Subunit: 466 residues, 4 copies
């Protein structure tokens, strides 16, 4: 009553009477109880499956292999799923065995049952629309599933880049706010030469801007797809025109410029695109983490630190230390970046585990990439909104570090040479006397020329000799 | 109406009127929206915080620092949390900035507000029970929080070892079922010498049994705790007798044999125990993955593989290939193992990121360890129940591999020497003739002696020559 | 006597009297005794330093900043180093502190002392040619050193791709050798559908061919260089026209199409190019390892394995098992691939450790990438010469696997539907009767049609329905 | 003339006429040209092989299986190798295929040929002492080789711990030098509460002291050995008393307390001990790296940093910035630590690649562990001798940070409560007035009590309330 009985290769099984999924999905629900992450939590992934199934059905219809009415109803069911309906009917664990077969069959069963309803039949009456013979016609998991992954990740990358662009813009705006803050550059954490905080924050923006092209060019690799490979890449049970026509139909339906891999036998076990895209995310996370490490260091203080900048105060720092406020927003970003790096290692193991004509470890690989994308979007939005936008500088503290530095002696090299500048630098360190006073003390340069050479505003760019 | 107004260092903030948490927890909820994993999902972690707060209050009372009535009501509130109540009042993200302060203050606020109710006051009337001055008395996040992590992970390790032991026993029972199945060992995937499946499956059990002592001895490192360190390990604001007395009280309350670190300045930034415990989980996951790789290989077939064993058939293998059934249960375990390995790298980055008197990256480190423990328990239960318990062998296929192998010639080395055995082996490979027939043709041993040495049952143990 | 005395900021120090390096190189020799890997072992790295110093000197002269005669002798010294002379004068550890300053100063000292000789002076008479004021004029380590790394790695990538392409061609030739070997595809290690070994080995070639563009496009990122950044990217002490002119001169001198980074402040701490290039090497190593895993599996045997292929026999397999021969060449490649993956993690830690205006961890990062390139070239040559070129197939063994398989039932789906094909497949497994015989016993298809559908030669490509 | 011809399963091959190795070693030299790291570079590894062969021969003699004269001469040859002779006769690459067979046969061939000379025969006259039938009697590579690895790593761990202990003592001595340097603790890089630099450097010593037990207890796992396993753990061809007797003889000969694994089938593919030992090295490297990061931060300066400590000046910091000196010794240690972490990932991949009755990836696993041991010993020696021993503090700079801090307000909590302390802290930050002056201004505590509570020397330990 509350169930219907379905059957497959394994035998008979009860399915909830109103479920749009069928017996093979039910088995996968039962078999893989690993995580709290399920396909229903990934709307772009479900949408991509619906794109794939709509394209395959349209191609089968155009090639004379699928009845016009069944195609019409598969397309309507796919349109509904694309529009956001029935996603609760996709309940399997993102960490699952079977190499994606359980997700492909989940799509086949849900679409078949909705198409049956549109034909005036009841769920489970697969004699009128078969998950295998109609919704999966001319397909395998081993092309439909990776093609769905690739379109989903291509689309998710668009959203990752969008949040990255907003973060970049936040750094550029803050660089303009801070453009007149002269401060001391540091290399190896030792005093170097002067710079502006505008230069430093524009450098944050510009190194992150480089990641746009890295993320986009590697996500473009996902557009090479293998529809028509069927089981292992030979195209067994596909029509000679199907691979090209299905790929063209899929490009039009999805709006992604998918193209057909030139060797489908090569493509079917190929996980390289996922590896290098995960690596591009790792590269960006390494840069983001470094930037956050810099921010926590420059905000150190208030009395025993560098104290060049102030981060927005978002919560009390300490249960015991009164008045303390900690850089909690860069800290949570660092932690996300470490998770991304670890997830990238998971991807590497999964990719290296492929065997012969298929890699069966793509579920955890996809789960890890999608988790990294989600966490990175959230970390970047948090960093932008609750930290970068409201940063201020301690301008006088920074300027006094420059005025009292020895490193400005570097600007004298073109005039007195490195040996003589070193003599001045050593004496400044040993005695505490200023570089400026020592140069005049030793009568190395006129005051008029020295005033130009040691002006901090004159050390921010290359210049001809004064 | 639906809110009350609380205040902290940052300012005033609305808090849901019936929440047991307070302003600092609310800020953390607002500040860290990263993941779908929250403290409320980790009962052992919440319970450990309640142990710590009950022990600290009891110690403060015994030292004359805390009123008897406030101690009594803190204790009652902690007892309720230990018993499983009010866990929904702990809603912050497991990936959070602030180095744990938001979890410590969440415990301080919830316990204070419950103690206030027991005193006949209203939530937020902190003048009668202060989150900082009473519930956090003599403490910092920087001892209460890592002590809670360590007790929680020590207790979660017990559950991990319990599920591992059930899996070990499943392998032992299956080894007994298969004890008479003689088969070919393989090294470097080349034919080696005979063995039994009893030997092979007991070896699975025995290598996993070795992980019990590794997990337990590394989890024992968590018992070294730092109560009394307060902010950085100096014990500022603690009574001289507090560190020893609080640790003793915590051992009695928690039932874990916690001991006091001999150098609290050393202990406060120390993440080494988490690193090596995570590594012990990684080692066990590597072993589990290798075993699952073996099972998928020995189950290969049915007509073009090794086909030594049959795994329970848990779902149809293929949307296109009829009759195919895949080793989906070992596959999902492999994937969990890869996730554990990646999470262990996240732990390594977090640990290496410590600075001076504190490591602020413990939230994601703990999140990753707890995720690995949960996934491993689920993977081991799944492997046991849906695969190991029901394995069968193809006994005649295995025996015929032994009888037809060349590698059994190895058993003749003590009688005819390696050069002569090599001559037999080369001729067997080149001609397709059997080792047995070739030895008799060359008349290197009597038929009666050869019948003994090359009997499959006599090639499984050391033996005396005759 | 056998020494000369030189001095620097630290003080006076003995240098071997005939060494071309000077005091700062001697200090680095003394300070960093870590590994057996020294700069003298990396000719492309030394050559790149000479390119950089020649280009900088040419530019300084073209800007009127360096005497034409001193430029001429610096150029001659650089030409000698480029031609392969004096590489023993570069003896520092590849794992060294100082962020590359010790390598930059080694180049400055060697070139100065050779220029001094060409001018009729003695080594160490730096008053006539200064390592700092002449050979390092307008430069810092922080542009000369990464520019040298990037040119060296760009050139080393050419050699890596060259050896990869030889290996690819070896797979293509072997694919043609084996084009008529029909065999069983396998997914999830279960029998799938037929393919040819030509298809499988061409897929090996084609997946590796995809790595050419990945390695090349990521190595092209090295061409963005930062000459003119000087200490931190501000261009302090450089002429305004120097950065563009030096980059153009460097492109002409090196033959590499280097271009000037648009933000030198961004570029100076930027390690992203190394991270993603190392990741591209990792991706290729993961593919190579998978292919080697496949070869070891397909070569398993001779009597208890798959035994589809024979690898050239390169040494006795066993000290105890007579006649055994193991897949030692794929095995050593696997091991190199694991080393590449580990070295890639070292690169990731080094990159994430950058601080403010410089990343000081580039020596071990460069050491690790260069070690991976060298090991991979050796592994690929070994795999090609001692394995791939001589592979043969066991043609009858493979053909009989196809003839006796159940998986050919897949070809019936378009004619009888998946339900009926499943019934046939299950009966074939349960009874051992052939798929062909069962189809006729069920009167599903005529013999004439069945003979065409189930011909394995008709399963290797898509085709219209018979 | 300059060659002799030897024979094996593959065929005949020339060997250098005076080489103690034989044909199978020559093949391995020819087959594996990967790295510049050869067995001859690892004396403890060669020594361990000689222990193993001497113990096996003595046991075979005691069991009546080996002639007394052959045993005597094998023992003498092993003694010479143990004493350091003939190590140049072990020339194979540490990265090699064949799973260790090439190293086992190298030992068999060298020992056989030296035994032949002691018997008055010529090299290669194996009819009087057979590498396979005598020197390898009752053995496989698959017990002799891992037993040699395990004894070698057990002995190398002793040297690693020795160098760690020297470094620990260097930190303890320096802590005593700095015991009176009061300074500001920092958490999350924000001002925390006071400590002494003696506390901080003793914490360095004490956290490293914890690594001694981790390294030793994990190296003790190597003492479980598998002599008597022969090919796969079944003991085929061994006498039933051999495994126990050989292990006892090996313990006496080697001086290492080896014990017999209780399940030799389990032990033969078991790589878990290597994984967790490498993880213990990784944990120590993570701690060492953190300490070095701390040192580089505390040494930042001289005018724009924290400048708490001075590191010995070991070389000029910069080719351009005069007077600059960088923390190059902690930097090189950081880089070694990153290399150790990457090598640990190589170990993990190698371990997870085991298949059925053997793991063939142990050569690169062992190569990576031995590289990490060597690099870590050199890094620790360098850190001790060229940095820690000569550190000094800037005592007045540190004391003024404490005196001018706001964080000392924490000490007021037991007297005025956290809310009142927060009011003082916020007013100090906003106005720049001192915590001390504000407390007296607001008349919160008497000057007599305040002079005690806020004395820096009274904040370094727990105390009873003043
Ligand atoms: O919440 C605390 O007690 C400590 C915080 C910190 O170290 O900043
Ligand atoms: O579900 C499929 O179409 C394929 C599965 C497999 O390769 O076993
Ligand atoms: O060399 C041996 O004794 C074993 C080798 C193998 O397992 O093939
Ligand atoms: O050697 C240089 O030019 C720079 C060194 C530094 O950044 O300290
Ligand atoms: Cl999604
Ligand atoms: Cl540094
Ligand atoms: Cl997302
Ligand atoms: Cl929990
Ligand atoms: Cl192998
Ligand atoms: Cl759990
Ligand atoms: Cl080179
Ligand atoms: Cl599989
Ligand atoms: Cl090279
Ligand atoms: Cl050694
Ligand atoms: Cl921080
Ligand atoms: Cl060593």
């Amino acid at each position: 009553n509350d169930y219907r009985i379905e059957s497959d290769l394994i035998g008979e099984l009860k399915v909830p009477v109103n479920a749009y999924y069928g017996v093979q999905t039910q088995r996968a629900i039962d078999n893989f109880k690993i995580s709290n992450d399920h396909l229903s939590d990934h709307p772009e992934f479900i949408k991509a499956f619906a794109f794939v199934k709509k394209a395959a059905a349209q191609t089968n219809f155009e090639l004379g292999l699928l009845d016009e009415i069944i195609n019409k109803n598969i397309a309507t069911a796919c349109d509904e799923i694309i529009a956001g309906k029935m996603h609760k009917e996709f309940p399997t664990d993102m960490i699952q065995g079977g190499a994606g077969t359980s997700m492909n069959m989940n799509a086949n069963e849900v679409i078949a049952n909705r198409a049956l309803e549109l034909m005036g039949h009841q769920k489970g009456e697969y004699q009128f629309c078969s998950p295998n013979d109609h919704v999966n016609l001319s397909q395998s998991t081993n092309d439909a599933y990776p093609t769905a992954i690739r379109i989903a990740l291509y689309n998710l990358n668009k959203t990752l880049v969008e949040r990255l662009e907003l973060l970049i813009q936040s750094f550029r705006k803050k660089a303009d706010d801070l453009k007149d803050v002269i401060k001391m550059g540091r290399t190896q954490l030792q005093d170097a030469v002067p710079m502006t905080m505008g230069q430093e924050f524009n450098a944050f923006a510009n190194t992150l801007q480089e990641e746009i092209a890295r993320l986009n060019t590697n996500a473009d690799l996902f557009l090479e797809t293998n529809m028509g490979a069927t089981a292992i890449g030979t195209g067994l049970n596909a029509h000679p025109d199907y691979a090209v026509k299905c790929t063209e139909n899929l490009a039009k339906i999805s709006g992604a410029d998918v193209v057909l891999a030139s060797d489908l036998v090569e493509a079917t076990p190929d996980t390289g695109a996922y590896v290098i895209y995960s690596s591009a995310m790792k590269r960006m996370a390494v840069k983001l983490s470094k930037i956050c490490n810099d921010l926590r260091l420059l905000a150190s203080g208030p009395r025993a630190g560098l104290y060049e900048i102030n981060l927005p105060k978002m919560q009390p720092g300490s249960s015991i230390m009164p008045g303390k406020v900690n850089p909690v927003i860069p800290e949570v970003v660092n932690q996300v970046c470490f998770k991304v790096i670890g997830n990238d290692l998971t991807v590497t193991f999964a990719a290296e585990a492929g065997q012969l004509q298929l890699n069966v470890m793509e579920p955890v690989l996809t789960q890890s990439i999608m988790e990294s994308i989600r966490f990175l979007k959230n970390a970047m939005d948090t960093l932008r909104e609750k930290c970068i936008d409201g940063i201020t500088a301690n301008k006088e503290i920074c300027l006094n570090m420059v005025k009292n530095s020895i490193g400005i002696v570097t600007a004298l090299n073109p005039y007195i040479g490195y040996k003589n500048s070193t003599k001045i630098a050593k004496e400044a360190l040993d005695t505490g006397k200023s570089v400026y006073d020592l140069v005049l003390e030793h009568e190395l340069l006129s005051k008029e020329k020295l005033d130009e050479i040691l002006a901090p505003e004159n050390m921010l760019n290359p210049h001809t000799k004064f």
